[PDB]
C-alpha cells in the first residue's frame, strides 16, 4: 500500500510491553530496500562490492518521546534472529533517544571472500540488519507514536568492481 507514497520511508513505533522485531533490512544490494538508494543504485552497476555500510536511523517524534532501540547486524551464515537474545549476539548498537534523533550502525565488512556479489545469493549473502526495542518507546501519551526513518551510505573503505548493466532500469517502448 505504501509504495508510491512518501509514507514508505518510515515505520511507526509505539509503547509495547514485550520486545518485538520492528524492522529487518536484509543486507543485499539487489533488495529493493537498498537498491533504490544512492548507495544501492551505484552498487547495482557493479557485479561485486566489498566494504562497510553505514545505516543511520532517525526517530521523528516529539521532544518528550524517548526510547532505546537495539540495532543488530547478523553476520553472514547466521539465521534471522527472531529473539532479542539471538540478535544481541551479533554486531549490535543500543541507542537512546534524546537531544539528537539519529544514530548510525556501521555494518562492518564480515565476509569469507574478498568481494560480495551484488545480486544476493546464498553463497555470498550479506546477513541481516534488524531493529529491536531495547527497553521500549515511551511517548508522553498512552497512544503516542514515533516515526523511525533510515538512511544508508558507504564507508570510506567500500570498493566496487566489474561494472555491468543496472537491473534498476528497463526500456520496453521506444522513446520518440
Amino acid at each position: 500500500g505504501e509504495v508510491g507514497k512518501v509514507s514508505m520511508y518510515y515505520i511507526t513505533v509505539t509503547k509495547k510491553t514485550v520486545t518485538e522485531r520492528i524492522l529487518v533490512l536484509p543486507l543485499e544490494m539487489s533488495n529493493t530496500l537498498f537498491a533504490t538508494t544512492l548507495l544501492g543504485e551505484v552498487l547495482n552497476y557493479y557485479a561485486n562490492w566489498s566494504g562497510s555500510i553505514t545505516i543511520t536511523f532517525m526517530c521523528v517524534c516529539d521532544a518528550f518521546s524517548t526510547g532505546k532501540f537495539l540495532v543488530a547486524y547478523t553476520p553472514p551464515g547466521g539465521k534471522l534472529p527472531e529473539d532479542r537474545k539471538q540478535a544481541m549476539l551479533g554486531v549490535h548498537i543500543i541507542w537512546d533517544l534524546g537531544l539528537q534523533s539519529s544514530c548510525t550502525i556501521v555494518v562492518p565488512w564480515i565476509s569469507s571472500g574478498f568481494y560480495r556479489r551484488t545480486k544476493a545469493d546464498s553463497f555470498t549473502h550479506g546477513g541481516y540488519v534488524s531493529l529491536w526495542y531495547q527497553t521500549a518507546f515511551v511517548p508522553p501519551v498512552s497512544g503516542g507514536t514515533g516515526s523511525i526513518l533510515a538512511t544508508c551510505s558507504a564507508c570510506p573503505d567500500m570498493s566496487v568492481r566489474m561494472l555491468r548493466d543496472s537491473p534498476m532500469m528497463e526500456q520496453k517502448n521506444e522513446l520518440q
Partner: protein, 108 residues
C-alpha cells in the same frame, strides 16, 4: 501472529459517510493455524483519542478499518491525523499491536 500491511497510512475524506473505508489489512496466523478471537482485532488506543474508526471483518482473514460515524471528521477544525493501534490476538494467545496512521483530507 503478524498484522499484514499495518505499519501503514490510511486516508479518509473530510465529510465521509458512516461506513466508509480507510484501510484494508490482513493477519498471518503464526504457522499454528490458531484463528483470531472473534472480538479481535480491536483498537485499543488512538493518538489524541477517537471513536468512529471501527475495525470490520471482511470475507476471510482480511479485515478493514471503517468509520462508524459516531464522530465526524471535520478537517477545517481538528484533529486531522490519528494513530490508531490495532490489536490482533488469537485463540492460544500471541498478541500483535500495530499502528494505523489515519489522515483526514480536505474536501473543497
Amino acid at each position: 501472529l503478524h498484522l499484514i500491511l499495518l505499519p501503514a497510512t490510511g486516508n479518509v475524506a473530510e465529510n465521509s459517510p458512516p461506513g466508509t473505508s480507510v484501510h484494508k489489512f490482513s493477519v498471518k496466523l503464526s504457522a499454528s493455524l490458531s484463528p483470531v478471537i472473534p472480538g479481535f482485532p480491536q483498537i485499543v488506543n488512538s493518538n489524541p483519542l477517537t471513536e468512529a474508526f471501527r475495525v470490520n471483518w471482511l470475507s476471510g482473514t482480511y479485515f478493514e478499518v471503517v468509520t462508524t460515524g459516531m464522530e465526524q471528521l471535520d478537517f477545517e477544525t481538528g484533529p486531522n491525523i490519528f494513530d490508531l493501534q490495532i490489536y490482533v490476538k488469537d485463540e492460544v494467545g500471541v498478541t500483535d499491536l500495530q499502528v494505523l496512521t489515519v489522515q483526514v483530507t480536505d474536501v473543497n
